Amino acid sequence: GLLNLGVKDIGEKVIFDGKPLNSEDEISNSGYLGNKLSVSVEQVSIAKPM
Amino acid sequence: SDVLGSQLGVGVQVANRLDSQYDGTEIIAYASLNIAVLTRQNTNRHNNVTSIELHSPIKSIKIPGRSNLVGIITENSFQIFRIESSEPLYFVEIDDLQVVDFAFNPDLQQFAIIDIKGNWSIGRIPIDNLHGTIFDPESSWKRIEWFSHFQKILVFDRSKMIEIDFMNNWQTEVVQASNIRDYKRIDDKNGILLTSREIIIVGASPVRRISWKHDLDTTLRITVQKVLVAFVYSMRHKRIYMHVFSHEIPGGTPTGIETILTLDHIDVVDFLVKLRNSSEVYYYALSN
Amino acid sequence: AAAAAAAAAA
Amino acid sequence: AAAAAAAAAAAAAAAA
Amino acid sequence: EVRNYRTRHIVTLTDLLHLNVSRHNWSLAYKIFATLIRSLWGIGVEILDNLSNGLDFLQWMCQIYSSKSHTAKFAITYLWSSLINCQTENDLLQELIDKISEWVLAEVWFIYASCHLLKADTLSRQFVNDNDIKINQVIKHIHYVRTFLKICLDRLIENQLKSFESRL
């Protein structure tokens, strides 16, 4: 059907909260886009009006 | 010969029951509420690979066979685990509050359960139903074993030993002064080892018996080698003794730190495992 | 004798 | 247990 | 401590019920179970199938209670009884199966896939017979086979389906 295709189109939204990487010596800590609490939707379906 | 201790398994509990896998590589120790599995093949191997949480203290574990399943007995329910890639396959719940010992039929179809009430429960593994129950013993049945022919079954209880037909009814019984903690039937046949302070070898069906004294306290457990040539018994007085078939010439005697509650022998008479009061298991390699 | 007595009681 | 026993006895009596 | 008459009676009744299951007591189960009504019910489900006097209804009621909320123990059983029992209109059952799967997303999907397969086998032999027609049923059977193939995907089974199509 249509909805499954529709959810895929707007499939992922990512919000990043800044935090120190806390790794060893590397410039990646300064660049920390960070860790991505990736979110997605793989399937949506109306069950019934029962 | 002699036995050399290869490994120690720190269960951290006392180990009431232990089994070895079959070319066995894992040993299973039953403690209190859990069954620990250790891979002996990996000599540092300090900790157990897997743990199965059955219930309260564990009286007995038995592996079928081929070696796919494991049956654990303690409280009211008996747990059957699938060790094949373990997880609980099924559970058998009986009225009796506890089970002292377990035995598997040779065609792996039946489980025999030694109940505290004294009754013997026969369970059909496939239905997980109780086909039949033999009651004789007043009190708790402590131990059991199967006749070499597999036709008969022998059990010991508090103060008596009884022989049962597979068909049903009790063939015979022996009365003793004390409690009977453990028993074994010789694989060859014609010999029954009984575990009291004394160890008595009873001739099946003759009057004559042999009595051996090498235990100071109660003999908690006994097992015959598969070969039948010799057997071992364990005692409260921390000793594991190996004896010759029938009339028990002492082959060798290990002294452990504490009481030796349980024991098992590998299917090819290579290794011996004992469970101890010291909350550990000891693994021995038998040497030619 | 004992069996007969039981029947009477019933 | 006692109660159970009593019940059993009663049942037996009834049967008789 | 224990109740005077009531606790002891319940324990004894349960013990008697266990004895009845050990030995079939169609009559004992009927009266013992009734006395016992005063979770669990597998023995009750078992007695209806073991001793008949049409054992499908009780399981459905048990499955219906405690729905709101691995997977559910009451249920995965009820589904199996259905297909075996069929072995009334099936389509309906297939519909129900889908409904359950929708609500809850051992997977039920596998069971659903198996159920269609049974219908295909019936379709396969009816189609093979002359009493002689070229499109209709053959096309329907092909569609059913493709549908069955999709569900399993998301060796023995596949082989069987193929044999079936060829015969048709």
From Swiss-Prot, chain A:
Range of residues in the leader sequence: none
Localization terms from the record: Nucleus, Nucleolus
Annotated positions of the Phosphoserine modification: 23
Subunit structure of this chain's protein: Component of the RNA polymerase I (Pol I) complex consisting of 14 subunits: RPA135, RPA190, RPC40, RPA14, RPB5, RPO26, RPA43, RPB8, RPA12, RPB10, RPC19, RPC10, RPA49 and RPA34. The complex is composed of a horseshoe-shaped core containing ten subunits (RPA135, RPA190, RPB5, RPO26, RPB8, RPB10, RPC10, RPA12, RPC19 and RPC40) where RPA135 and RPA190 form the DNA-binding cleft. Outside of the core, RPA14 and RPA43 form the stalk that mediates interactions with transcription initiation factors and newly synthesized RNA.
Main function: DNA-dependent RNA polymerases catalyze the transcription of DNA into RNA using the four ribonucleoside triphosphates as substrates. Component of RNA polymerase I (Pol I) which synthesizes ribosomal RNA precursors. Besides, RNA polymerase I has intrinsic RNA cleavage activity. RPA190 and RPA135 both contribute to the polymerase catalytic activity and together form the Pol I active center. In addition, subunit RPA12 contributes a catalytic zinc ribbon that is required for RNA cleavage by Pol I.
Family named by the database record: Belongs to the RNA polymerase beta chain family.
Note in the entry: Three distinct zinc-containing RNA polymerases are found in eukaryotic nuclei: polymerase I for the ribosomal RNA precursor, polymerase II for the mRNA precursor, and polymerase III for 5S and tRNA genes.
Protein name: DNA-directed RNA polymerase I subunit RPA135
Biological source species: Saccharomyces cerevisiae (strain ATCC 204508 / S288c) (Baker's yeast)
Lineage: Eukaryota, Fungi, Dikarya, Ascomycota, Saccharomycotina
Record gene name: RPA135
Residues of the full protein shown: 59 to 108 of 1203
Swiss-Prot record, chain B:
UniProtKB keywords: Cytoplasm, Nucleus, Transcription, Transcription regulation
Gene Ontology process terms (BP): nucleolar large rRNA transcription by RNA polymerase I; transcription initiation at RNA polymerase I promoter
Main localization (coarse): cytoplasm
Keyword Flavoprotein carried by entry: no
Keyword Glycoprotein in annotation: no
Any one annotated GO CC term: RNA polymerase I core factor complex
Entry's localization field: Cytoplasm; Nucleus, Nucleolus
One Gene Ontology MF term: RNA polymerase I transcription regulatory region sequence-specific DNA binding
Physiological role: Acts as a component of the core factor (CF) complex which is essential for the initiation of rDNA transcription by RNA polymerase I. After binding of UAF (upstream activation factor) to an upstream element of the promoter, CF is recruited in a SPT15/TBP-dependent manner to form a preinitiation complex.
Assembly notes: Component of the core factor (CF) complex, which consists of RRN6, RRN7 and RRN11. The CF heterotrimer may further dimerize to form a hexamer. RRN6 interacts with RRN7, RRN11 and RRN9.
Extra information: Present with 237 molecules/cell in log phase SD medium.
Name of the featured protein: RNA polymerase I-specific transcription initiation factor RRN6
Originating gene: RRN6
Residues of the full protein shown: 9 to 554 of 894
UniProtKB/Swiss-Prot annotation, chain E:
Subcellular location: Nucleus, Nucleolus
This protein's record includes keyword Transcription regulation: yes
BP term (GO), one: nucleolar large rRNA transcription by RNA polymerase I
Main localization category: nucleus
Source organism superkingdom: Eukaryota
Transcription regulation in keyword set: yes
Gene Ontology cellular component terms for the protein in this record: nucleolus; nucleus; RNA polymerase I core factor complex
GO molecular function, one term: RNA polymerase I general transcription initiation factor activity
Keywords: Nucleus, Transcription, Transcription regulation
Subunit structure: Component of the core factor (CF) complex, which consists of RRN6, RRN7 and RRN11. The CF heterotrimer may further dimerize to form a hexamer. RRN11 interacts with RRN6, RRN7 and SPT15.
Functional summary from the UniProt entry: Acts as a component of the core factor (CF) complex which is essential for the initiation of rDNA transcription by RNA polymerase I. After binding of UAF (upstream activation factor) to an upstream element of the promoter, CF is recruited in a SPT15/TBP-dependent manner to form a preinitiation complex.
Note: Present with 476 molecules/cell in log phase SD medium.
Full protein name: RNA polymerase I-specific transcription initiation factor RRN11
Species for this entry: Saccharomyces cerevisiae (strain ATCC 204508 / S288c)
Origin organism lineage: Eukaryota, Fungi, Dikarya, Ascomycota, Saccharomycotina
Gene: RRN11
Full-protein interval shown: 204 to 442 of 507
